[PDB]
Design a protein around this motif. Structure first.
Motif, PDB file in Angstrom:
ATOM      1  N   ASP A  13      39.343   1.763  71.944  1.00 38.77           N
ATOM      2  CA  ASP A  13      39.784   3.138  71.718  1.00 38.77           C
ATOM      3  C   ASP A  13      38.971   4.102  72.562  1.00 38.77           C
ATOM      4  N   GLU A  37      39.395   9.164  66.062  1.00 39.19           N
ATOM      5  CA  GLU A  37      40.084   7.922  65.768  1.00 39.19           C
ATOM      6  C   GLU A  37      41.514   7.940  66.305  1.00 39.19           C
ATOM      7  N   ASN A  39      44.478   7.565  65.294  1.00 41.59           N
ATOM      8  CA  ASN A  39      45.645   8.183  64.697  1.00 41.59           C
ATOM      9  C   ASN A  39      45.332   9.588  64.255  1.00 41.59           C
ATOM     10  N   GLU A  40      44.190  10.092  64.730  1.00 46.26           N
ATOM     11  CA  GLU A  40      43.830  11.520  64.556  1.00 46.26           C
ATOM     12  C   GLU A  40      44.224  12.252  65.805  1.00 46.26           C
ATOM     13  N   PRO A  44      45.178   9.115  70.385  1.00 42.38           N
ATOM     14  CA  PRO A  44      45.880   8.312  71.369  1.00 42.38           C
ATOM     15  C   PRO A  44      45.521   8.692  72.797  1.00 42.38           C
TER      16      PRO A  44
END
Ligand SMILES: Cc1cn([C@H]2C[C@H](OP(=O)(O)O)[C@@H](COP(=O)(O)O)O2)c(=O)[nH]c1=O
Ligand SMILES: [Ca+2]
Length: 129
Positions: A13, A37, A39-40, A44
């Motif tokens: 990530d 993160e 999906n925060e 992406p």
């Protein structure tokens, strides 16, 4: 400090990558930064940035600081370079990471990264928008 070869196994990530280090597959955690993160918001995007910067480099390198080389989770701790450009810095400069987790004795590039973060703030990029 000095650079050494990094053997990329895979992107993970925004601020972690999987390296083969002395033949051991290890998660490496980028020093001095914090990406969202996945999906925060901006997650992406930070992921994709780190993934492409490292994958597309002909010359992938890592650089340990003076203090601890692994964290409490067994993750390696390094600055990562892609064709001599520091990923950690570039994330911060683009407003995809904050300067974070600054611990004394593993903080050699602190000022460099804070300079980058101030300009990302000035420009209202991403995290700072
Ligand atoms: C970047 C970094 C994180 N860590 C630890 C602090 C945080 O621990 P705690 O988990 O106990 O809060 C965690 C943050 O990692 P992530 O941002 O990868 O989640 O990793 C270090 O110990 N040293 C470091 O240099
Ligand atoms: Ca993070």
């Amino acid at each position: 400090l000095h650079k050494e070869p990094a053997t990329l196994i895979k992107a993970i990530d925004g601020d972690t990558v999987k390296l083969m280090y002395k033949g051991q597959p290890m998660t490496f955690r980028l020093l001095l930064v914090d990406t969202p993160e996945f999906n925060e918001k901006y997650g992406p995007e930070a992921s994709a940035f780190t993934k492409k910067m490292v994958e597309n480099a002909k010359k992938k390198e890592k650089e340990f600081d003076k203090g601890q080389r692994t964290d409490k989770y067994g993750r390696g701790l390094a600055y990562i370079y892609a064709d001599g450009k520091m990923v950690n810095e570039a994330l911060v400069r683009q407003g995809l990471a904050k300067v974070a987790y600054v611990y004394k004795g593993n903080n050699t590039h602190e000022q460099l990264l804070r300079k980058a973060e101030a300009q990302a703030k000035k420009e209202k990029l991403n995290i700072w928008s």
